[PDB]
TrEMBL record:
Cu(2+) binds at H1, H85. It comes from the Bacteria. This is Chitin-binding protein. The chain holds residues 28 to 193 of 478 of the full protein. It comes from Listeria monocytogenes serotype 1/2a (strain 10403S). It is found in: Secreted.
Amino acid sequence: HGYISKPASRVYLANKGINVGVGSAQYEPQSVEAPKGFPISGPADGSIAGGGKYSLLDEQSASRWAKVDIESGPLTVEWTLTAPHKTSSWQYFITKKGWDPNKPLTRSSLEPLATIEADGSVPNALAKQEINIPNDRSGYYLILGVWNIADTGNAFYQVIDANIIN
Ligand SMILES: [Cu+2]
């Protein structure tokens, strides 16, 4: 169990009262748990942000969500792990240049951003990965972070509403 605390995820911002209207998700930012193996297995298209668990997180419009300022260049993503587990990988995706901010999030919406493979070890409770925020684009993009658990069929899904600045 865990969530992305910096840059703050959509559900973490709901937990801190910055996003509103997500119902039960607001109390369990650490529990957006669904099958691993994305972008094959995992949450269904249109239900990725809520992990197939929290449907109010799946709403998508230009104005719906608070956006976190992220400058282009190197970024260290921080996960707060309320229950660290043996880990097989950390995956990051970003919406494609030209994506439609008023449509549901699907596999076809995304492209790969970064993957940090892991050796099965249990990470630190503040788990950090280095990624590169591109400078080929500006403004509102979704970044999907996925924490894949080595010893179960599951993963934790953390969409971030990013404002890429350059
Ligand atoms: Cu857990």
